Design a protein around this ligand. Sequence first.
Ligand SMILES: Cc1cc2nc3c(=O)[nH]c(=O)nc-3n(C[C@H](O)[C@H](O)[C@H](O)COP(=O)(O)OP(=O)(O)OC[C@H]3O[C@@H](n4cnc5c(N)ncnc54)[C@H](O)[C@@H]3O)c2cc1C
Ligand SMILES: Cc1cc2nc3c(=O)[nH]c(=O)nc-3n(C[C@H](O)[C@H](O)[C@H](O)COP(=O)(O)OP(=O)(O)OC[C@H]3O[C@@H](n4cnc5c(N)ncnc54)[C@H](O)[C@@H]3O)c2cc1C
Ligand SMILES: CC(C)(COP(=O)(O)OP(=O)(O)OC[C@H]1O[C@@H](n2cnc3c(N)ncnc32)[C@H](O)[C@@H]1OP(=O)(O)O)[C@@H](O)C(=O)NCCC(=O)NCCS
Ligand SMILES: CC(C)(COP(=O)(O)OP(=O)(O)OC[C@H]1O[C@@H](n2cnc3c(N)ncnc32)[C@H](O)[C@@H]1OP(=O)(O)O)[C@@H](O)C(=O)NCCC(=O)NCCS
Ligand SMILES: [Cl-]
Ligand SMILES: [Cl-]
Lengths: 565, 565
Amino acid sequence: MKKILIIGGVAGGASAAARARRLSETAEIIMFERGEYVSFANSGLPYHISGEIAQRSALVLQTPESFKARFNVEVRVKHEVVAIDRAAKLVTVRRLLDGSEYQESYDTLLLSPGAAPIVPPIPGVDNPLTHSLRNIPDMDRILQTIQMNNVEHATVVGGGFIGLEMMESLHHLGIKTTLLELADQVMTPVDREMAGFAHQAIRDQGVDLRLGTALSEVSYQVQTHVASDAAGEDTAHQHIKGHLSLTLSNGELLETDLLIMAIGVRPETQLARDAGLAIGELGGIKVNAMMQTSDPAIYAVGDAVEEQDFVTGQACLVPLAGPANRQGRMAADNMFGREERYQGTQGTAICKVFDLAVGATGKNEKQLKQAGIAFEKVYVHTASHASYYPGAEVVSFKLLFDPVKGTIFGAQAVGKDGIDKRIDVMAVAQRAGMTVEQLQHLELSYAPPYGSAKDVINQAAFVASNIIKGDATPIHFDQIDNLSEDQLLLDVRNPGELQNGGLEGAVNIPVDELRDRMHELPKDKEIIIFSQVGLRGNVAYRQLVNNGYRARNLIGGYRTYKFAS
Amino acid sequence: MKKILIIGGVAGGASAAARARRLSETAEIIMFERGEYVSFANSGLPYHISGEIAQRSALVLQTPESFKARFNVEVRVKHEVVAIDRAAKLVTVRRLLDGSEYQESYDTLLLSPGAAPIVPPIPGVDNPLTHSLRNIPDMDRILQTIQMNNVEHATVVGGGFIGLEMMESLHHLGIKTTLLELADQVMTPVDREMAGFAHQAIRDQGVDLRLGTALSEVSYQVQTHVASDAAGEDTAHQHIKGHLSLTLSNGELLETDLLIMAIGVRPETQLARDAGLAIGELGGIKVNAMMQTSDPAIYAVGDAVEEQDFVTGQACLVPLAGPANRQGRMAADNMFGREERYQGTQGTAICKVFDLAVGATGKNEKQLKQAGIAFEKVYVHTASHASYYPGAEVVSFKLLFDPVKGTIFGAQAVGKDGIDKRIDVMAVAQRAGMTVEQLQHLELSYAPPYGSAKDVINQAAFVASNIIKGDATPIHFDQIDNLSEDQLLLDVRNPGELQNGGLEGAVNIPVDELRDRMHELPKDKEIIIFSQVGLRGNVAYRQLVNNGYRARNLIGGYRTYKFAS
Ligand SMILES: Cc1cc2nc3c(=O)[nH]c(=O)nc-3n(C[C@H](O)[C@H](O)[C@H](O)COP(=O)(O)OP(=O)(O)OC[C@H]3O[C@@H](n4cnc5c(N)ncnc54)[C@H](O)[C@@H]3O)c2cc1C
Ligand SMILES: Cc1cc2nc3c(=O)[nH]c(=O)nc-3n(C[C@H](O)[C@H](O)[C@H](O)COP(=O)(O)OP(=O)(O)OC[C@H]3O[C@@H](n4cnc5c(N)ncnc54)[C@H](O)[C@@H]3O)c2cc1C
Ligand SMILES: CC(C)(COP(=O)(O)OP(=O)(O)OC[C@H]1O[C@@H](n2cnc3c(N)ncnc32)[C@H](O)[C@@H]1OP(=O)(O)O)[C@@H](O)C(=O)NCCC(=O)NCCS
Ligand SMILES: CC(C)(COP(=O)(O)OP(=O)(O)OC[C@H]1O[C@@H](n2cnc3c(N)ncnc32)[C@H](O)[C@@H]1OP(=O)(O)O)[C@@H](O)C(=O)NCCC(=O)NCCS
Ligand SMILES: [Cl-]
Ligand SMILES: [Cl-]
């Protein structure tokens, strides 16, 4: 009989306990959870706050009792592991109900303690109106402040998925909200020009979005005066729990009834550092492909561990649920001696931003330049399904690739429909090792309500392949303001379109008149073309190079350029 | 100048015309179309009938004048090519206005004449109330008979995708509909147990669905009595364009005001036969992977041609638009000497069936059985996204595979949401050569409005892999009604579920009471287990097999079983 101990009872740990039982009826399996619940839906938390998930019960998927009855796993809630004594193969456990302590032995241990919200060195940030969100109790504390302090304005710090989901929820409740992000964008897995779509959706919701802005100080002021009907004052706009006064990195003041801190999570490494387990250079527990720590009897999974990046093989931190469930499953396997290797993380993710979804997988352009990896990029703006059918929405899609070998580095997409499907297709093609040239041959579902004869993904593969083969010559949005004297900017859109915007200094020849008016264009200038989304631009470009011009086409067209600034 | 001639100005021909122009400004390009429209949305026609697509102009994507302005292609509408003289490189062309003819020389010809609806040898089939649907004038004639003959009841023959779309579209106009199909199922790309979900959806809408049944005779009866208000009669339910009396294959009479024939299409091969071009055994034009016919100067693309099945590499006929459009473009590359090879057809398809979508890629189990290829299947019935999030729907998913090599032969999926996404991911996985064991490491997008932490596809990969590894032992819906004396049937649902249907003779032990009650099961029999969807069944199976019983779990559970009859 192996005795298996599991630390943490949610995505990594609960996943390991269940698989471990299916693998062996003779193992004793004990699972410790310092909180009151196991198997709850962390991802549900922001949606219960807005009432979108109306029922609290929907957030709890198993109980200690249901884990005993189904899996004969002893789940101990309110029991926090406080030490691991490796040589003795004993853990010390604390019963949070009374503070008493006991020890328990293991043959093998799995650590899945997750990652804790990041506490920023901001004076005053510890106070009755400031909260992070990790679990059900942090959610109740948020819900309680909202009710009790009559919250009418809230501020969210941080523009990753947790902070956008909080921003969205609080907006759902009619709360006026301010989002502060220190970066120049929300959602760092996408690149800044892709984020410009979400920035405008956020601003059209009346949210006060402050990018490039840090929170420097928090001042909490207790309310000393309770207004009352009996004293004939208005009480509707009163805050009995107090007031926050925020000082920002530019000395401006923000007044707020509630502050959500959502600036990232840090792996839970204290048990593991106290036990002498190796920690990586990002601050996560270090594990081999088999998710074994520096002690071969101890395994670790999920948001506490560093993972290998699929694309680069380098270490990364990717706190998502998919990888933690599949890791917990595979450490159970390994713990019965199956030697299964985890295959690295692409960091496939997707976040709801009001009516938009913003998706990415693999590496973005900031991560590629930083590691010195040479790359090329394309943009398409193509209907989510046959345009002539109702409800079609523009998907803006970025593909990043090796301009020689055609390796896929990453893909990003933003828009109001079909985003999860395009990201999921690129995730599988990258994982399977397909090159951009091979992407051209994908054979995806087409009927008018669901797709289009040539998909979003096929169009992107043709535009990228045309670059790789020398059939297209690109210029990008960040190059096109900076033209030299042997370049002539040509706009191939129709004249009426120019009023929504265009570029300073452009000659206008509409694409469908170009073949005839082309002698107006001198052959001793490189002609720098642009259209609305890049498509008519390519047609023109082809016409020109077929006639001996030197030319470039603006990838993603004016649309990309416009959301890039 | 190369002189390029193109027969057919829609999906194959038009794609090849536009590509060919991007390839060369000097090439003379002439494209003949026997009808009045080029580049029209064939797929949109049933949708404009219903009024789902409100304006006829949405079905027309180019015009001869747009094709000449943008691409300098001379489109000749109402010109029909009536012969090819290959040895002289001349086609004979008929002007359908006049009946006059001429010749036109070519350097290279492309045939993309499509496929014609199949004409059944039924007596009486040719009459004014019976119509098939290939193009805009077909569509207009159906609309005309609808309005003129005050259609209140119609009959559709054929349960393929066009027949299904026309049934929905008629239902949508308030027209009572009967669907007749000779096979035992609608939508033959999917297996009969998957189409059972579609049968229920269609019946639920009050459509009269008759599987297994052919049309034997049609009788058209012209109307001699026009009811009038002046003679004080009810004019409301009259049909001045007459009446159809249909005789069915089992003797029954069916009376209807309109008959729609959608029994499939047949490649247009007459021109290719008269010219001596090779024709394959399925009756389509025979091409190599460069799209070239038996004459090197003559290419052929689209519905008129036989393609190469991705999975087996034998011949098939797949009349679908994505392949047509990518074949056309590659043919034009080949005409300029680029020697590109098409990579075979997976048959990826999806059809909207009322609220349901039914999709497939690859080979089905009928087709694998016919070719004598050894396979295995799994079913899963998994929420389309996190089910604690509103809107989740059940995706019923079938994976066909090689039970020893893990090769992916095909996948099928039915449900009200997320179908296009799951079939797309499978088409990508199969195309890139992943095996079922590799599917388990797919990292798909997860946020609650869009997926779940383990996607539908991961769940199906785990269940197939358990079977390959020997960790699961399947029984299927069509074996479970048998059962020898060495076998015992165990339902592991909860007692209240047995009220919604069960399997006669089951012993019921709920899985959550099974570890304590297991001694009730004798160990000298194989315990044949079922739960609702297969999931609790697997938990059970593992407990028994870990205690030294012989057992099998029913794959897809009672749900797959139920929809199989
Ligand atoms: C609001 C929110 C929304 C999210 N949305 C998504 C999403 O949409 N998509 C997605 O992929 N991911 C999302 N995530 C992330 C996903 O929840 C995590 O990546 C995943 O839960 C990590 O699993 P884990 O097992 O590593 O850690 P956790 O799920 O954090 O589980 C760790 C458990 O260990 C317990 N514990 C820690 N130390 C001890 C100890 N010493 N003794 C006993 N118990 C201990 C903790 O209390 C915790 O309950 C979201 C997270 C949050 C907070
Ligand atoms: C109602 C309907 C709905 C459909 N829905 C879908 C769907 O949802 N998804 C999907 O993938 N596919 C769908 N299809 C199929 C798809 O439209 C076809 O696969 C694609 O059109 C075939 O392209 P093609 O170029 O081979 O044929 P076509 O589009 O049929 O074009 C051939 C053209 O050649 C012309 N022609 C023939 N002979 C001559 C001649 N001798 N001279 C001059 N002209 C000639 C014909 O008039 C015709 O216009 C649908 C088809 C129909 C009819
Ligand atoms: C649910 C949870 C308790 C684990 O239980 P689990 O039994 O391993 O998981 P599932 O219910 O997903 O079932 C998976 C098993 O069922 C099997 N299965 C799934 N569908 C099946 C079907 N229809 N038929 C037969 N077997 C099936 C799978 O193969 C797998 O078993 P295996 O691992 O032995 O191959 C756990 O992962 C969890 O606590 N997660 C919720 C919390 C969380 O993830 N939070 C993160 C952010 S939201
Ligand atoms: C549209 C049609 C005329 C062909 O036009 P086309 O110019 O080849 O096709 P598209 O608009 O799809 O453009 C594809 C081209 O633009 C390029 N492109 C697409 N988006 C781009 C972008 N944003 N930037 C740069 N280039 C882009 C692609 O690379 C491709 O050019 P390439 O083939 O030389 O690589 C033709 O397919 C047709 O008549 N279809 C309607 C009929 C039909 O298909 N119906 C069947 C059932 S609905
Ligand atoms: Cl454009
Ligand atoms: Cl079940």
